[PDB]
């Protein structure tokens, strides 16, 4: 009856602007806010949380988890509240699961600035740390570099068509099984489009998270000095040295360390070359 204070003239617009539950064929409501916040009021939370979008965050934030031990009621509660962080924001949303997905990126989006932050860490309680030691010893074989002569006739090779068919098989043939140091020389003395490159670097760095996924690290006490099972990341060389690669790659067995990491490349620039590739056809087949 009259009297109220929660959504704004436009944002109450867009809540409202919002479908419930698939099938329901029902529309958001000033009642359902209300009910909305009565329920956190009901979880031990502030209502006036819900008030702000601050607060419903703090609410959908521990609501995540207490969503796995509320149940189906609770449940839409928290759909409620997304919806709304949705039209705190105001992202662009028309149902229930649309604020999830919506305020999904948002999220990963916010969580993302905290991450980075942490890890440019200043204003926080930080602990020390000490640094060990231990005698510095000689791996096997002693792989060359990559000449300038070549870095060279690749540069050519990419002024000739960077981004092709022709290239994906062409680059591999100057890195032709070659290591980090060798690839990350090649692809610096590359020169296309950075855009590009960063894509690649995603697909590349995602093949080795990929890779790891797929690859169970299961070795237990291994041998002193032995030659652990590198992952993904480390055939990146990022666990693992220009030096522990080469040997890794020459290594008994030998290990497609290198090799791992050019296929890569050709993952990354074969996706490059689909993106420019001259009018592309359509395909798809799949299996259920």
């Known amino acids: 009856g009259a009297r109220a204070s929660v959504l704004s003239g436009g944002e109450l ?9 698939p099938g329901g064929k029902k529309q958001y409501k000033l009642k359902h806010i209300v009910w909305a916040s009565r329920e956190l009021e009901r979880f031990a939370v502030n209502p006036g949380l819900l008030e702000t979008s601050e607060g419903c965050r703090q ?7 207490s969503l796995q031990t509320g149940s189906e009621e609770l449940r839409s509660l928290y759909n409620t509240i ?12 028309k149902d229930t699961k649309e604020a999830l997905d919506k305020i999904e990126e948002e999220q990963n989006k916010s969580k993302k600035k905290a991450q980075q932050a942490a890890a440019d860490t200043g204003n ?8 060990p030691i231990v005698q510095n010893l000689q791996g096997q074989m002693v792989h060359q570099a990559i000449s ?3 870095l060279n006739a690749w540069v050519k090779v990419v002024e000739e068509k960077a981004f092709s068919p022709e290239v994906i098989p062409m680059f591999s043939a100057l890195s032709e099984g070659a290591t980090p ?4 020389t090649m692809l610096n003395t590359v020169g296309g489009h950075q855009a590009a490159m960063q894509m690649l670097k995603e697909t590349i ?4 998270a990929e890779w790891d996924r797929l690859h169970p690290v299961h070795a237990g006490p291994i041998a002193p000095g032995q030659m652990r099972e590198p992952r993904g990341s480390d055939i990146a060389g990022t666990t693992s040295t220009l ?3 080469i040997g890794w790659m020459t290594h008994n067995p030998p290990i497609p360390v290198g090799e791992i990491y050019k296929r890569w490349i050709i993952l990354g620039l074969n996706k490059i070359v689909r993106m420019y590739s001259p009018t592309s056809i359509l395909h798809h087949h799949h299996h259920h």
């Open 59 to 65: 609410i959908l934030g521990q609501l995540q988890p």
């Open 181 to 184: 140091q060798d690839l990350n």
């Open 148 to 150: 300038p002569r070549t």
């Open 243 to 245: 030096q522990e690669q």
């Open 124 to 131: 926080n309680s930080q602990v020390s740390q000490n640094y």
């Open 82 to 93: 997304a919806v709304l962080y949705c039209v705190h924001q105001r992202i662009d949303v």
């Open 13 to 21: 617009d867009k809540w409202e602007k919002i479908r419930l539950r």
């Open 205 to 208: 760095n995602e093949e080795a």
